[PDB]
Design a protein around this ligand. Structure first.
Ligand SMILES: [Ca+2]
Ligand SMILES: [Ca+2]
Lengths: 256, 257
């Protein structure tokens, strides 16, 4: 089995995050591609040039457009990246064989695309030393975050090697969830996002996405399969890559 | 307990030091890695600069903030050796030791670019790396984007593949601003030359040959040399523990002075 995975990071993060996983997938025969979204990683744009999911997601869309024939990709989205892969599946359902959510926001079809994010914001507010800020983009004022050291070390990379905490500390950039724009979008549909195999992977020691919250997401719109990864934090791809690679192997096999 | 300032080479950034920082901190030291201009996640773009003074700004600004009577250990890797050399020349009072890490180590008899011109003469195997240029002020500047094979075969030649993959999604277009470098006045005895210089190198370096690094050592003898068995050009990635052990000794050497 040879599959093409596209790996999508959350806000504030970037392609670099997937560094442990790419080689594992490639050793198993697969193609694994991680890209920077706009104003993320080393993308030269700045956040203020951007205020919408369509522009934030451009590089993912552009990439999927360039997939040939009736070939299909597996989209893997972590944390807030789940929204990105959901948009992509809604826009190019023919090109996606499976969606993998990785401690990720997993939308549904019965509610606004921002529903699942509003629930997270309602239930987690312990941002500690993270710095919030906002800016103007047309008629919207946009709220942005720079992730704090304690947030990285205690809540996100909570069970990863300290050197990965230190790595993130010199790489994370200002990010936003563009919530006004998200709320603005039409619900996902049965025939788009809803037509694709969805796999929910989560980490037993996630200190930002509670067990309660991730279970809520699973029950709110049941996926085709669920995996719990013992001892993993929010960043499975950093704290337990081998398990994550094992799981992704099965997803590839199951895709066909 | 010492304050190390860790300086990456061109195309690279602060991120590179991620394995080392926690090691130095566990041992009681302060370790600070910064991005130079248009490097790492610095928001500037390369075309906005064309000189070493502006490229180094964040290092200079940082050292300016260190107060009288206090000193730092500057650790410079690869092309980062030039940066720490400039800093020592400009703020010799604030530097207790220079550590070169498979790095360009200048001298005082020759132009500051001498040691880089020698490297360019002796290594040209750039493979899939892409060269380009642009205009800045009255100079045209040559820039490089490091290729996948260059990273995997020549630079990270003995590091875990995941680090090769990491660099692949982080390296940015860089330049050595050679016209500007050749433009600068020679380093001096009383500046750059007045500081303890430690030359650290990796046995398996596939970009800075053993012959070249030895040439650098003999061209301007350092106060100590370390060879790290099995290390590639990126010691801080392929052999951090040995590197941390070495830096401990340098810190000890620096104390009581
Ligand atoms: Ca996150
Ligand atoms: Ca290098």
């Amino acid at each position: 089995v040879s599959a093409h995975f596209i790996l999508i990071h959350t806000i504030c993060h970037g392609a670099w995050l997937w560094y442990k996983l790419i080689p594992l997938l490639q050793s198993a025969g697969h193609n694994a591609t991680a890209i920077d979204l706009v104003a993320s990683g080393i993308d030269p744009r700045q956040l203020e040039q951007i205020g919408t999911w369509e522009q934030y997601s451009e590089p993912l869309f552009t990439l999927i457009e360039s997939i040939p024939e009736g070939k299909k990709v597996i989209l893997v989205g972590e944390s807030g990246g789940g929204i990105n892969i959901a948009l992509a599946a809604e826009k190019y359902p023919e090109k996606v064989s499976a969606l993998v959510f990785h401690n990720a926001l997993m939308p549904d079809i019965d509610h606004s695309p921002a529903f699942v994010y509003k629930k997270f914001s309602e239930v987690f507010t312990d941002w500690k030393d993270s710095i919030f800020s906002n800016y103007t983009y047309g008629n919207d004022t946009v709220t942005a975050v720079e992730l704090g050291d304690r947030t990285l070390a205690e809540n996100i990379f909570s069970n990863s090697p300290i050197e990965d905490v230190e790595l993130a500390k010199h790489l994370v950039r200002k990010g936003s969830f563009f919530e006004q724009d998200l709320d603005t979008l039409p619900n996902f549909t049965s025939e788009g996002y809803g037509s694709i195999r969805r796999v929910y992977v989560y980490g037993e020691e996630d200190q930002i996405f509670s067990r309660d919250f991730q279970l809520w997401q699973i029950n709110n719109y049941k996926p085709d399969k669920v995996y719990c990864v013992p001892s993993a934090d929010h960043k499975i791809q950093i704290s337990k890559v081998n398990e994550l690679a094992q799981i992704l192997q099965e997803v590839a096999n199951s895709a066909s």
